Ligand binder design. Structure first.
Ligand SMILES: *C(=O)[C@H](CCSC)NC=O
Ligand SMILES: [K+]
Ligand SMILES: [K+]
Ligand SMILES: [K+]
Ligand SMILES: [K+]
Ligand SMILES: [K+]
Ligand SMILES: [K+]
Ligand SMILES: [K+]
Ligand SMILES: [K+]
Ligand SMILES: [K+]
Ligand SMILES: [K+]
Ligand SMILES: [K+]
Ligand SMILES: [K+]
Ligand SMILES: [K+]
Ligand SMILES: [K+]
Ligand SMILES: [K+]
Ligand SMILES: [K+]
Ligand SMILES: [K+]
Ligand SMILES: [K+]
Ligand SMILES: [Mg+2]
Ligand SMILES: [Mg+2]
Ligand SMILES: [Mg+2]
Ligand SMILES: [Mg+2]
Ligand SMILES: [Mg+2]
Ligand SMILES: [Mg+2]
Ligand SMILES: [Mg+2]
Ligand SMILES: [Mg+2]
Ligand SMILES: [Mg+2]
Ligand SMILES: [Mg+2]
Ligand SMILES: [Mg+2]
Ligand SMILES: [Mg+2]
Ligand SMILES: [Mg+2]
Ligand SMILES: [Mg+2]
Ligand SMILES: [Mg+2]
Ligand SMILES: [Mg+2]
Ligand SMILES: [Mg+2]
Ligand SMILES: [Mg+2]
Ligand SMILES: [Mg+2]
Ligand SMILES: [Mg+2]
Ligand SMILES: [Mg+2]
Ligand SMILES: [Mg+2]
Ligand SMILES: [Mg+2]
Ligand SMILES: [Mg+2]
Ligand SMILES: [Mg+2]
Ligand SMILES: [Mg+2]
Ligand SMILES: [Mg+2]
Ligand SMILES: [Mg+2]
Ligand SMILES: [Mg+2]
Ligand SMILES: [Mg+2]
Ligand SMILES: [Mg+2]
Ligand SMILES: [Mg+2]
Ligand SMILES: [Mg+2]
Ligand SMILES: [Mg+2]
Ligand SMILES: [Mg+2]
Ligand SMILES: [Mg+2]
Ligand SMILES: [Mg+2]
Ligand SMILES: [Mg+2]
Ligand SMILES: [Mg+2]
Ligand SMILES: [Mg+2]
Ligand SMILES: [Mg+2]
Ligand SMILES: [Mg+2]
Ligand SMILES: [Mg+2]
Ligand SMILES: [Mg+2]
Ligand SMILES: [Mg+2]
Ligand SMILES: [Mg+2]
Ligand SMILES: [Mg+2]
Ligand SMILES: [Mg+2]
Ligand SMILES: [Mg+2]
Ligand SMILES: [Mg+2]
Ligand SMILES: [Mg+2]
Ligand SMILES: [Mg+2]
Ligand SMILES: [Mg+2]
Ligand SMILES: [Mg+2]
Ligand SMILES: [Mg+2]
Ligand SMILES: [Mg+2]
Ligand SMILES: [Mg+2]
Ligand SMILES: [Mg+2]
Ligand SMILES: [Mg+2]
Ligand SMILES: [Mg+2]
Ligand SMILES: [Mg+2]
Ligand SMILES: [Mg+2]
Ligand SMILES: [Mg+2]
Ligand SMILES: [Mg+2]
Ligand SMILES: [Mg+2]
Ligand SMILES: [Mg+2]
Ligand SMILES: [Mg+2]
Ligand SMILES: [Mg+2]
Ligand SMILES: [Mg+2]
Ligand SMILES: [Mg+2]
Ligand SMILES: [Mg+2]
Ligand SMILES: [Mg+2]
Ligand SMILES: [Mg+2]
Ligand SMILES: [Mg+2]
Ligand SMILES: [Mg+2]
Ligand SMILES: [Mg+2]
Ligand SMILES: [Mg+2]
Ligand SMILES: [Mg+2]
Ligand SMILES: [Mg+2]
Ligand SMILES: [Mg+2]
Ligand SMILES: [Mg+2]
Ligand SMILES: [Mg+2]
Ligand SMILES: [Mg+2]
Ligand SMILES: [Mg+2]
Ligand SMILES: [Mg+2]
Ligand SMILES: [Mg+2]
Ligand SMILES: [Mg+2]
Ligand SMILES: [Mg+2]
Ligand SMILES: [Mg+2]
Ligand SMILES: [Mg+2]
Ligand SMILES: [Mg+2]
Ligand SMILES: [Mg+2]
Ligand SMILES: [Mg+2]
Ligand SMILES: [Mg+2]
Ligand SMILES: [Mg+2]
Ligand SMILES: [Mg+2]
Ligand SMILES: [Mg+2]
Ligand SMILES: [Mg+2]
Ligand SMILES: [Mg+2]
Ligand SMILES: [Mg+2]
Ligand SMILES: [Mg+2]
Ligand SMILES: [Mg+2]
Ligand SMILES: [Mg+2]
Ligand SMILES: [Mg+2]
Ligand SMILES: [Mg+2]
Ligand SMILES: [Mg+2]
Ligand SMILES: [Mg+2]
Ligand SMILES: [Mg+2]
Ligand SMILES: [Mg+2]
Ligand SMILES: [Mg+2]
Ligand SMILES: [Mg+2]
Ligand SMILES: [Mg+2]
Ligand SMILES: [Mg+2]
Ligand SMILES: [Mg+2]
Ligand SMILES: [Mg+2]
Ligand SMILES: [Mg+2]
Ligand SMILES: [Mg+2]
Ligand SMILES: [Mg+2]
Ligand SMILES: [Mg+2]
Ligand SMILES: [Mg+2]
Ligand SMILES: [Mg+2]
Ligand SMILES: [Mg+2]
Ligand SMILES: [Mg+2]
Ligand SMILES: [Mg+2]
Ligand SMILES: [Mg+2]
Ligand SMILES: [Mg+2]
Ligand SMILES: [Mg+2]
Ligand SMILES: [Mg+2]
Ligand SMILES: [Mg+2]
Ligand SMILES: [Mg+2]
Ligand SMILES: [Mg+2]
Ligand SMILES: [Mg+2]
Ligand SMILES: [Mg+2]
Ligand SMILES: [Mg+2]
Ligand SMILES: [Mg+2]
Ligand SMILES: [Mg+2]
Ligand SMILES: [Mg+2]
Lengths: 29, 246, 112, 50
RNA sequence: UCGGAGUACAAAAAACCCUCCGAGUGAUUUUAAUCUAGACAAACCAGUCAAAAUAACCAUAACAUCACUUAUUGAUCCAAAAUUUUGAUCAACGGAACAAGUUACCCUAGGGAUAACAGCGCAAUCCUGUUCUAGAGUUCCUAUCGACAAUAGGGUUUACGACCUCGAUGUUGGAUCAGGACACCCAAAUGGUGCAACCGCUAUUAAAGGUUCGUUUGUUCAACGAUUAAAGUCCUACGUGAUCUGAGUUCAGACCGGAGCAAUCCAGGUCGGUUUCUAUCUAUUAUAAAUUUCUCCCAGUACGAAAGGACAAGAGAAAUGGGACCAACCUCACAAACGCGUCUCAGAGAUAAUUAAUGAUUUAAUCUUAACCUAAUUAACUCAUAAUAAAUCCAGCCCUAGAACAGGGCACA
RNA sequence: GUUUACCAAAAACAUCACCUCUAGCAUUACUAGUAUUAGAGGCAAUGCCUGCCCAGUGACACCAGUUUAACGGCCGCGGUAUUCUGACCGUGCAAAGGUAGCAUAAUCACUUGUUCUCCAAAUAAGGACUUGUAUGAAUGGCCACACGAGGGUUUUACUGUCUCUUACUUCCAAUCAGUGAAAUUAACCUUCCCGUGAAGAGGCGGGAAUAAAAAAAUAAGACGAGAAGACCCUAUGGAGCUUUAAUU
RNA sequence: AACAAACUCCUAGCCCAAUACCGGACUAAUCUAUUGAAACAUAGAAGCAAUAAUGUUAAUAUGAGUAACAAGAAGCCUUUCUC
RNA sequence: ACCAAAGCUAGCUCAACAUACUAAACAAAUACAAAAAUACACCAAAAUAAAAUAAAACAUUCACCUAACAUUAAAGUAUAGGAGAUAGAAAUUUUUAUCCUGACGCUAUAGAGAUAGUACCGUAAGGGAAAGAUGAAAGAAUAAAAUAAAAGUAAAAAAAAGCAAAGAUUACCCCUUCUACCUUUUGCAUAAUGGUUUAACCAGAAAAAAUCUAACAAAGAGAACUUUAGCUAGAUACCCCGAAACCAGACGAGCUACCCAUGAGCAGUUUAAAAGAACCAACUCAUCUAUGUGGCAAAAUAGUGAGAAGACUUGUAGGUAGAGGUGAAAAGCCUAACGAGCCUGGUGAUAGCUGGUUGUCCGAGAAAGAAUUUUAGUUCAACCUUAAAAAUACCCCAAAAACCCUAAAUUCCAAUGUAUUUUUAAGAGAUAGUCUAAAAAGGUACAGCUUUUUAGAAACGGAUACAACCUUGACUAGAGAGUAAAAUCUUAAUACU
C-alpha cells in the first residue's frame, strides 16, 4: 500500500471512480 | 488430535509446566499447612441431634451403658483407626432438644454437651484409646477371630495427660472426689437443678466404668475368647497375670 | 547505522475515568485515577496519596465545574492567584457523590 | 459433481434457447424481441417464454 | 529490565534494529503502627489505593518530604542470623546451582517459513526523449553544446523486497546454431550547418542482408598489431552443458603472508582435482525470383585566391551468400565421392522522411488530417516468371534411386 | 623412494647431514645390548651462514636462577645539511627493537608497480629498481651440481590441432531370423501465439491451426530422469578435533 | 428497453454452505447369548471398514519386442583350406 | 478365450493341571585342522553392569531393568528428592481344600521364523525365506468336477477439439459448460509433495474430577474407605512409520597398514661396479588422453608412461582388535560407506521435525493479547463447542469526561426496536495472515515492502482469465417468473496577410 499523498496520481477505488463520474458539472444549456 | 506440533504427536509436557516459565506451583513460598498432619489426632463428631435420633428409633438403648462399641453397632458413627482417628467427640448441636438419660463414654466432650446430658441426669466420661486398642474396640468380632489375647489399654501421651486428668473434662483418670463439685459448677453456670443420681433405680448401670487397663466391659487383659466353643480362657502363670494387670 | 534510542517501551498505567455521571457507587469505589490533577475531588470524595479519587458515601456520582480557592500554605498556587487580574476567577472540575441512603432510622426496640 | 452443476445450468440453457427461437420468429414479422415482449405484457397477456 | 513525551489529536489498550529524554539512587527528619468495609489494575505471578475501628502522641493527633517523583528494582529453592531478619550486572533482568571455540572431513531431521544462481515486483542507481533559457559559441540562446530546474517513458547495471522452486530451477567464459527489438555501426533516401569542394558535426526515415583475423589474461571487459563498407547497443533462464569444453569459480590434498595459545579461518594468492542418461510426448527435419566492395571513366572536370578536390551517369573485375557440377588440376590402389577447381545468380508494382506543381477556407500567399489531377522519391513486401504435373505393369534382376518403405530402368543393349 | 585402494602422485611425508632432549642399566620389548649406546622430537645433503631477546608462557632448578637449533617476540613522535633525502639531535616506551641475505616472490591489498630484453602486437616468461610498514635466518635464510610422468616460458623439427574439411575400411548402425533387460509412469483424446495466473501454461481467457497411424533422425520445452540439496539457515538434533570453557 | 445469480417470488417438500476442535443420529462385515432356518431380529463384545505413508509381500503392465547378446568357409561330415 | 479364482487341513496361540525339568539316538568314531584306535602331563581364572531415555538443556537424580516369598488393606500415607522430574516403604491386617479346562484365539500375506533355523546371503559372530488344495476309489489321466468374476491381453488399431465428463440428443463424436486428487500453505491446475494399476495386510489405548442411567439413601459398599445428599455399579478417553547417535558383550589382519618366520624371482646391454648409477623386457606401480558411465569391470579396456640388483617385487603361514590396532600424517587402512569396523542385545532408543491416519448423514464453528534458551513449541486470557442455572443484553436521547491549539469520532446512559447476555460444570483447537478502503510510521511522499489501530472479504454471478474489488440470508425437485452487480473509456485542437 502507498501513502495518502503520492507523486503518481493515486488510482482511486472503483466505487470512488463512479462517484467522481456521477457528480460531474453540467453547464446550463 | 490437531495439525503438527506436540498435539498431534502426543509429546506435550508434563502437568503444571508452563513452557520454561517458572510454574505456578513452584513460585509460591513453602508454608506449613500439612506439616505433621499424619500425626495430628482426629475425632469424629457426634451431635446430640443424632444421639437423640438413634435412641428414638431403637438404634441404641439407654437401659444398657453406651460406649464407642455400641455406637458402631448402631451404625451411628464409623471410626477408621488407620486415618489417625482417636475416637468420637461430643458436640452440642442439639443440646436444646436432648431429653434422653444415658451413661455415654466418649473420647472428647464440650462444656455444653456435658451440661445438656447432666441436666437430664446422665453420666459423661472421657477415655483415651490407643490406635492398637481402638482398632480392637471398634471391630471386636474380627479381633476375637485373630486368636490373640486381649492386650492392655495404653496410657495417654504427655500431650493428652491434662485433658483426661482434670475434672472439668470428666476425665476417666481424674480424681473422683472433685467430680461432685465440678458437676455443681455446670449446674450453677447454666441454671438447671442438678439431679440426685444416687436415688435413681438405674444407679448401678450409670456407675459402671472401665479399668484404665481394660478394654471391654467385664473382660480382662490376657483372656482369650474362643468363640467356636463359647468359652473364655484365662492365664495362670504369675508372670502372665502380673504383666496383663500392671 | 545503529539504534541510539533505548528504553522507550513501557505499558500504559490505565489512567482515566472509571465511573461516569449517574453510576451508583458504594463506599470505597475508586471514581477515577490520574497522573496530574485532572479532576479535583469534591463532596464525599476522598483523595489518596497517588491522587486517585474514591467515593466516601454510597450514592450517585456527579461532575461539576466550580471555583478554585487554593490552600494558603501552598506557595505555588497562592502565587498564581495573586498575579491574576481583578476580573478573573479560576475554574476547575470536581467530582461529587450525592448521598442516597440516609444516615439511619429510629425503630421501636422495646416498649416498657 | 458435474451432474448437479449442469442441472442448475439446464434451466438457464433452455431459457436461452427459447429466447433465440422467440427472437427468430419475431424478426420474421419485422419486430424485434425487446419490442415484442414489453408490448405484449402491456396487453396483460402473461405467457412465459416456454 | 523499569519510568516520562510523541507515533497513540477526544475513555482504556496498541507495534517496529521508530523519533527524543532518563532510572539500577542520594539528601533530610516529620523514623512513617496494628486491624479491616469497598474498589482500580491484571492470563498467571506480581502491583496499587482505602473509610470505619484500636494504639501512638495537640490528650476525640497516620500521606515521611525534596530532586520532571513517575522508574530507583529480582520468584521459588537454598544459605546465614536471634526465633523478629538479610542474601545475586541470577542485567540472557518470570531468573537452568555450577559449561567456551572450530569443523571446507562433516553427519541426520526439515525449510523456498530463510540466503546465493534465475524469474517477478519496484525504479533509489542506470538509460532514452521533450519543456525552460541564464550562458559557452569574437557579434549571435537552440550549427554544435547548455548550469539552477520542469516532465514523460524504457526495464541493461548495482541494490531493495523475499512472492514460485532447497523429496535439487546445475553456476562464469568460450565452440556450434542462432530467434528478436531499433535507442542504426555499414549499405539506401533526406533536412540543417559557424555546409565552397574534400573531410566532418547534427537531425528525420528505413531492421531484407552484413558486422574480420591475431599477441597477453580463465576471462566478459580493457590495452596493443594488421585490416575492413562497418568490426553497432541490448534482450532471449545476462539464449544454448538430456550438444561439447571445465582454464576459473566451487568439496576432500599442500604450501606462502596474516589473524588465533591451539583446532582452524581469509571477495588474498599458488599447484592438483569423476561433467551421468538407451528420446515416452510436444516441436522440427530444402523451392527459386542475390548483396557489397574495388578499378577504369566522367576528371584534375564541377567547386575554389590558390592549395586541394566531387556527386550522378557509363563500362569492367572480384568477394560473400543461395543453388549446382567433375573436362582438367588436386585428394584419389573402385567404375565414385570431394575442394583447393569449374558453373550460374533476375524484371514489375508498392512505399517512409523529404521535395515540387495547381488551389480554397483567408478571391494575396500557401506541397492539401481541403477537394481533383499530377511529379521526383529508402528498405521491406507483393507479384510477373520459373520449378512440381500421366490415378490403379510391377514377381524377379539392375541402378549414378535408397536406412526400411518408395523411385528409375529390364524392345533393339 | 612414499601417500589419499575407488576424482588430488604434488611444491606434501620420508631421507643421508646438523642439532636439541631424556636415561649409569639384566633374565620375554628396548637387549641376550651399556653414553662412539638406546629412546622422545625438530629441521632437511653439500657450500657460506644461523643475528638480537628469559619480560611473558612452558620446562629445568623444583631457592635465587638457568634455558629460545622451547612455544614466541624482535618500536614510535618531532626537528635537522638552499630544495630533496635525513648522517645527526630532542624525547618516550621496551625482554630486545628485523642484523646478514633475498625480494612485486607460491609472500593481504594497492597490482596489469616502474624499466629493459624477447614478439608485427606481451595482464605471460627472464634480468634489474625496491619499506617486504604483513619478507627474514634449523616453524631456517641464501647460493649451486645432479635429478623430476610436478608448475611456467622460448627456439628448432614435425604434423588435420587449425585456415577447411575430404576419401576409404572395421566395430556400431538400418532390414531379416532367435533370445530379450533398465531407470520411468496420477489419468491423458498429450498443438501454436498473446494475455492472465503461487509471479516462466499442451489444459485458464481471447484468438489461430487441425483426416488417422508407422519407420528413421536432430535435443528447444515437458521448471526432463537420477540422489527426502553437498551450499545457506533452523533444531534448547548428533559427532570429530583444540584449549585460557564448566565439572573431575 | 432487453438479456442477465447460491438473491426473491411461484408449485411440492424430507424447510438453508464450509477448513481445525466439539456435539448427535444411523450403519457395512465378524464372534457370542436367545431368536431366526432360501440369511435374520433385540442385545453383549472387539485384530470392527483404506483412491494416498518415495508404505510391505505377491502378481501384472508401460518404457519394448526397444537397449543388448552369438557360430571363420566349402565338402564326400567330419576331412581339407583361410587366419 | 488365456493369465487367473475358490476350498480346509497342516499346525500354532494363550492358559490350566501336572509330573518335578538338558528330549530322541548312541555298534564305531568325536575338542590332531571334531567325528582320524594307540605315549611321559602342566592345569587353569575372577573386578559394582553401562547407556539410549526423563528433567522439554544437562552435570546430582531417572520406576521395571540379576538376586522379592504371594494376595485384600494400611497407601500412593510416613519419608527420600538441582526438595525439581520423579522415587516410595513398614508396623499392623486379609486369603478353605480335590474334581468341575477349556476358548465371544487365528485358518496358509493369519497363527511360532518353520514343510525350517533347512535352502540362500556372510571369512566369522550373525541374518534368514517363499512354498499345500480333485474324488469314496487316480489299482476311475480316450479321467473328473468347479468360479469363468482383480489388474494385464485377445475377440474388436485409429478419423479435427482438448483434466476426457456432464447437460443432453432420433444420432458414438460434432454443440454447450467445467483450472485432476491428497498433503502442505496467507494463497497451489500450478512447472510444490506422493501415487503404473490390482488383490491381501497396515494406524486412537488408559476412567482422578465430571455428564448420562440405575440401586440404596443420612447413609452407601459382599471388611480395610468415602460421607453437611451423598455413596456403589455401569457407559462415555488420549495413534502408526522414520533418524544421525549412545552403552555393554561377541566375532573379524584369507582384502589392506606394519612386523616376525620360512621360501622363491630379476634375462640381455653399458661400466674397475650388484653404484638406493644408465638403456630396455619379465615383473610392480598408474602419469596423460580417449572410449566406458545399469559398463567387460560396484574403478575396466586401448594407446602412452615411471621404476626395473633394491627403502625392490612375491608365495605359504603366524602376530597386533575398536576408549583400540597400524601408519615414510593422506585424519590413510583394519572384507566393496571408517572424523572411526561389523553383528547381536539395551530397542517398540528419542525426535517441538516430515509423511500417513480407513463408513454415511446432520448441528454449531475460531487468524493470535501475555510469559517463555521462547517466537517450527507449549501453558494461561479472549473467542468458541456441549450441558445447566438465572436475569437482563444490544441499539442507546438529554446530562457528563483538562489544563495552550486541535478532525473523523469513542466512553457512559433512559426510551424504543429486538432476543440476547451472564453465571456454573466439562472441554479441546488456534497462538507462522493475505489484500482492499481509512489514520500514521520506516523507505526512494519505491515495492504484490514492513510495523500498529478501525472496518471489510475470501460466488457455482459480474470485472474476457482472476483467493482479497462489486452484486449476494449458500436446502432438495421443476423443460416457471421478477430482479441485482455489470459488456467497447474520452478528447486525440493553434494560418494571421
Ligand atoms: C557457491 O559456491 C555454492 C556452492 C558451495 S559448495 C561448492 N553454489 C551452489 O550452487
Ligand atoms: K531468558
Ligand atoms: K526498489
Ligand atoms: K533450490
Ligand atoms: K540484424
Ligand atoms: K507433452
Ligand atoms: K580426399
Ligand atoms: K493555409
Ligand atoms: K610419482
Ligand atoms: K622465562
Ligand atoms: K622478476
Ligand atoms: K615427480
Ligand atoms: K528436447
Ligand atoms: K520440488
Ligand atoms: K514439504
Ligand atoms: K502425500
Ligand atoms: K593373523
Ligand atoms: K571385466
Ligand atoms: K521448536
Ligand atoms: Mg493500506
Ligand atoms: Mg500432516
Ligand atoms: Mg505448527
Ligand atoms: Mg530461562
Ligand atoms: Mg471417617
Ligand atoms: Mg508495548
Ligand atoms: Mg511510551
Ligand atoms: Mg477491572
Ligand atoms: Mg481513620
Ligand atoms: Mg526450583
Ligand atoms: Mg525474558
Ligand atoms: Mg514483565
Ligand atoms: Mg529446572
Ligand atoms: Mg583444506
Ligand atoms: Mg541432509
Ligand atoms: Mg511466514
Ligand atoms: Mg539457471
Ligand atoms: Mg535474486
Ligand atoms: Mg522460475
Ligand atoms: Mg517506469
Ligand atoms: Mg554570450
Ligand atoms: Mg521519473
Ligand atoms: Mg519466499
Ligand atoms: Mg512478509
Ligand atoms: Mg520433483
Ligand atoms: Mg556465444
Ligand atoms: Mg540474428
Ligand atoms: Mg529510427
Ligand atoms: Mg549510411
Ligand atoms: Mg547461460
Ligand atoms: Mg555454459
Ligand atoms: Mg553431457
Ligand atoms: Mg539443456
Ligand atoms: Mg580446475
Ligand atoms: Mg601457514
Ligand atoms: Mg597431474
Ligand atoms: Mg587450479
Ligand atoms: Mg521420435
Ligand atoms: Mg541422442
Ligand atoms: Mg563515379
Ligand atoms: Mg558458389
Ligand atoms: Mg490563390
Ligand atoms: Mg507466385
Ligand atoms: Mg518403377
Ligand atoms: Mg620419484
Ligand atoms: Mg586417489
Ligand atoms: Mg598404491
Ligand atoms: Mg591419480
Ligand atoms: Mg655446522
Ligand atoms: Mg640446509
Ligand atoms: Mg620436506
Ligand atoms: Mg622447507
Ligand atoms: Mg635464531
Ligand atoms: Mg626469569
Ligand atoms: Mg637483488
Ligand atoms: Mg626467491
Ligand atoms: Mg601480493
Ligand atoms: Mg599462466
Ligand atoms: Mg602462450
Ligand atoms: Mg625477477
Ligand atoms: Mg613476519
Ligand atoms: Mg622457533
Ligand atoms: Mg615464515
Ligand atoms: Mg647428487
Ligand atoms: Mg622440467
Ligand atoms: Mg617454431
Ligand atoms: Mg529382431
Ligand atoms: Mg493429438
Ligand atoms: Mg505465458
Ligand atoms: Mg479457448
Ligand atoms: Mg485456450
Ligand atoms: Mg530404432
Ligand atoms: Mg528416434
Ligand atoms: Mg504439465
Ligand atoms: Mg532444465
Ligand atoms: Mg529433474
Ligand atoms: Mg531435505
Ligand atoms: Mg556447511
Ligand atoms: Mg529455541
Ligand atoms: Mg543438544
Ligand atoms: Mg543427547
Ligand atoms: Mg565417541
Ligand atoms: Mg578450566
Ligand atoms: Mg435469471
Ligand atoms: Mg453449518
Ligand atoms: Mg488456513
Ligand atoms: Mg448387531
Ligand atoms: Mg483395522
Ligand atoms: Mg485396497
Ligand atoms: Mg523416486
Ligand atoms: Mg500404497
Ligand atoms: Mg497373488
Ligand atoms: Mg512387451
Ligand atoms: Mg524407442
Ligand atoms: Mg542393436
Ligand atoms: Mg533430557
Ligand atoms: Mg520431547
Ligand atoms: Mg539406569
Ligand atoms: Mg538436604
Ligand atoms: Mg505362514
Ligand atoms: Mg490370510
Ligand atoms: Mg481378469
Ligand atoms: Mg468436446
Ligand atoms: Mg486456482
Ligand atoms: Mg510459501
Ligand atoms: Mg493453518
Ligand atoms: Mg504435481
Ligand atoms: Mg517440500
Ligand atoms: Mg512421482
Ligand atoms: Mg470417575
Ligand atoms: Mg550420555
Ligand atoms: Mg562400544
Ligand atoms: Mg596376512
Ligand atoms: Mg640384469
Ligand atoms: Mg637404476
Ligand atoms: Mg591400460
Ligand atoms: Mg590407452
Ligand atoms: Mg594411435
Ligand atoms: Mg624407464
Ligand atoms: Mg631414472
Ligand atoms: Mg580375537
Ligand atoms: Mg587411535
Ligand atoms: Mg607405507
Ligand atoms: Mg596435514
Ligand atoms: Mg585435513
Ligand atoms: Mg566396511
Ligand atoms: Mg517415534
Ligand atoms: Mg504470531
Ligand atoms: Mg483457553
Ligand atoms: Mg448522548
Ligand atoms: Mg442500558
Ligand atoms: Mg506459532
Ligand atoms: Mg499481514
Ligand atoms: Mg504485505
Ligand atoms: Mg482486522
Ligand atoms: Mg466469473
Ligand atoms: Mg434461499
Amino acid at each position: 500500500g502507498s501513502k495518502a499523498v503520492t507523486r503518481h496520481r493515486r488510482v482511486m477505488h472503483f466505487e470512488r471512480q463512479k462517484l467522481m463520474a456521477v457528480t460531474e458539472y453540467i453547464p446550463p444549456k | 488430535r490437531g495439525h503438527k506440533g506436540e498435539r498431534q504427536r502426543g509429546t506435550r509436557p508434563r502437568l503444571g509446566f508452563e513452557g520454561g516459565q517458572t510454574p505456578f506451583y513452584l513460585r509460591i513460598p513453602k508454608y506449613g499447612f500439612n506439616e505433621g498432619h499424619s500425626f495430628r489426632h482426629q475425632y469424629q463428631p457426634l451431635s446430640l441431634n443424632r444421639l437423640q435420633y438413634l435412641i428414638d428409633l431403637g438404634r441404641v438403648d439407654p437401659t444398657q451403658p453406651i460406649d464407642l462399641t455400641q455406637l458402631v453397632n448402631g451404625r451411628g458413627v464409623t471410626i477408621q483407626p488407620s486415618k489417625r482417628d482417636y475416637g468420637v467427640q461430643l458436640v452440642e448441636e442439639g443440646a436444646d432438644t436432648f431429653k434422653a438419660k444415658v451413661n455415654i463414654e466418649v473420647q472428647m466432650a464440650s462444656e455444653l454437651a456435658i451440661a445438656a446430658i447432666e441436666k437430664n441426669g446422665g453420666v459423661v466420661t472421657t477415655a483415651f484409646y490407643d490406635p492398637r486398642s481402638l482398632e480392637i474396640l471398634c471391630k471386636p468380632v474380627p479381633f476375637f477371630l485373630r486368636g490373640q489375647p486381649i492386650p492392655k489399654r495404653m496410657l495417654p501421651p504427655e500431650a493428652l495427660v491434662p485433658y483426661y486428668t482434670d475434672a472439668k473434662n470428666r476425665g476417666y483418670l481424674a480424681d473422683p472426689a472433685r467430680f461432685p463439685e465440678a458437676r455443681l459448677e455446670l449446674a450453677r453456670k447454666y441454671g438447671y437443678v442438678l439431679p440426685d443420681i444416687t436415688k435413681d433405680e438405674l444407679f448401678k448401670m450409670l456407675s459402671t466404668r472401665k479399668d484404665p487397663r481394660q478394654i471391654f466391659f467385664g473382660l480382662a487383659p490376657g483372656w482369650v475368647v474362643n468363640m467356636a466353643d463359647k468359652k473364655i480362657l484365662k492365664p495362670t502363670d504369675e508372670n502372665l497375670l502380673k504383666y496383663y494387670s500392671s | 547505522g545503529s539504534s541510539k534510542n533505548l528504553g522507550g517501551k513501557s505499558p500504559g498505567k490505565r489512567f482515566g475515568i472509571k465511573k461516569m455521571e449517574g453510576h451508583y457507587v458504594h463506599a470505597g469505589n475508586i471514581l477515577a485515577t490520574q497522573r496530574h490533577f485532572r479532576w479535583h475531588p469534591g463532596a464525599h470524595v476522598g483523595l489518596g496519596k497517588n491522587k486517585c479519587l474514591y467515593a466516601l458515601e454510597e450514592g450517585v456520582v456527579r461532575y461539576t465545574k466550580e471555583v478554585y480557592v487554593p490552600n494558603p500554605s501552598n506557595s505555588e498556587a497562592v502565587d498564581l492567584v495573586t498575579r491574576l487580574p481583578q476580573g478573573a476567577v479560576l475554574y476547575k472540575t470536581f467530582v461529587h457523590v450525592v448521598p442516597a441512603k440516609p444516615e439511619g432510622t429510629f425503630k421501636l426496640v422495646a416498649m416498657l | 459433481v458435474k451432474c448437479t452443476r449442469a442441472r442448475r445450468l439446464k434451466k438457464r440453457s433452455l431459457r436461452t434457447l427459447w429466447i433465440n427461437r422467440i427472437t427468430a420468429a419475431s424478426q420474421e414479422h419485422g419486430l424485434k424481441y425487446p419490442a415484442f415482449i414489453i408490448n405484449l405484457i402491456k396487453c396483460q397477456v402473461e405467457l412465459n417464454r416456454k
